[PDB]
């Protein structure tokens, strides 16, 4: 009980600092080419709001823990993970387009493909939810969920990446961290829930700060006056 709550606190600590940083990042002036980074940072702040509501609920609920509340995290993830995948797409497009691109052009051109990515991701979460609530066995959950995880990342890779080390860092860091949620699924309640508490820091709040640093680095001259 204790170590779950201590990790929830650590996660909440990073979330609050990250939220403050992201808010200031909204007000950094941007050059034409970098406009989409503020768009990304709005959608990472939306993810934070959903994140936080879950954590507050969690630390209140963990006072009188009578049952296994791991499955409640899916009501978070079913909302946050598609948003996270879209921002990843927008960040890859930013990194990889020679001309300035904005999320509207992306969304109007790619909405069908984006729906396939989010459908694959929804199936991953659905299979996890069925396993996490014991409606299918753990082995079927890990194989079915991993299949869809791989499909989601494959679709992302073949459409939006380029073959270079900046892409590999962003893609494979994300891929590994997401896979580690599947790894956590294998563990008993307390250890599982602790891992998810620390994984959220990496999957959400390190991303936001990264985007913040990219914005600051791109705009520092424009900012300074
Ligand atoms: C928005 C303002 C903050 C709300 C978080 C309040 C959370 C306080 C809950 C603490 C419960 C506890 O003691 O655990
Ligand atoms: C963590 C270390 C970062 C690795 C590379 C990813 C960051 C790449 C940032 C690209 C920003 C940039 O150069 O934007 C203008 C062009 O597009
Ligand atoms: C902000 C929350 C995020 C990024 C959470 C993502 C969760 C996953 C990628 C979970 C995936 C699963 C597997 C890879 C296999 C077992 C079932 C899941 C749902 C735990
Ligand atoms: C933590 C806070 C870090 C903020 C760094 C950037 C500051 C942006 C302020 C923007 C105000 C308008 C500038 C023109
Ligand atoms: C071409 C290389 C594609 C690499 C995809 C990585 C994620 C999916 C793993 C295999 C299904
Ligand atoms: C070129 C670099 C490819 C490295 C891919 C494997 C290491 C990263 C972790 C992958 C986790 C699924
Ligand atoms: C990056 C993910 C880190 C995962 C480790 C979480 C720490 C707690 C794990 C269980 C400890 C017992």
Automatic annotation (TrEMBL):
Top-level taxon in the UniProt lineage: Viruses
* Modification N-formylmethionine occurs at: 1
Name of the protein in question: Uncharacterized protein
Q: Which organism's genome codes for this protein?
A: Organic Lake phycodnavirus
Taxonomic classification, please?
Viruses, Varidnaviria, Bamfordvirae, Nucleocytoviricota, Megaviricetes
């Amino acid at each position: 009980m204790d170590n779950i709550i201590m990790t929830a606190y650590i996660s909440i600590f990073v979330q609050i600092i990250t939220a403050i940083i992201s808010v200031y990042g909204l007000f950094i002036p941007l050059n034409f080419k970098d406009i989409i980074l503020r768009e990304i940072l709005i959608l990472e702040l939306i993810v934070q709001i959903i994140e936080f509501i879950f954590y507050i609920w969690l630390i209140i609920t963990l006072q009188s823990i009578n049952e296994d509340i791991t499955y409640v995290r899916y009501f978070d993830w079913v909302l946050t993970t598609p948003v996270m995948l879209l921002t990843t797409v927008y960040f890859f497009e930013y990194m990889n387009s020679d001309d300035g691109i904005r999320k509207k052009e992306i969304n109007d051109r790619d909405y069908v493909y984006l729906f396939y990515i989010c459908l694959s991701n929804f199936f991953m979460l659905l299979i996890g939810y069925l396993g996490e609530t014991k409606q299918i066995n753990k082995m079927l959950t890990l194989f079915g969920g991993s299949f869809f995880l791989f499909l989601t990342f494959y679709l992302l890779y073949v459409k939006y990446t380029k073959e270079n080390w900046m892409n590999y860092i962003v893609f494979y860091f994300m891929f590994l961290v997401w896979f580690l949620y599947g790894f956590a699924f294998m563990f008993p309640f307390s250890i599982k829930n602790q891992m998810y508490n620390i994984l959220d820091i990496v999957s959400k709040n390190i991303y936001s700060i990264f985007i913040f640093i990219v914005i600051l680095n791109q705009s520092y001259k424009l900012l300074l006056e």
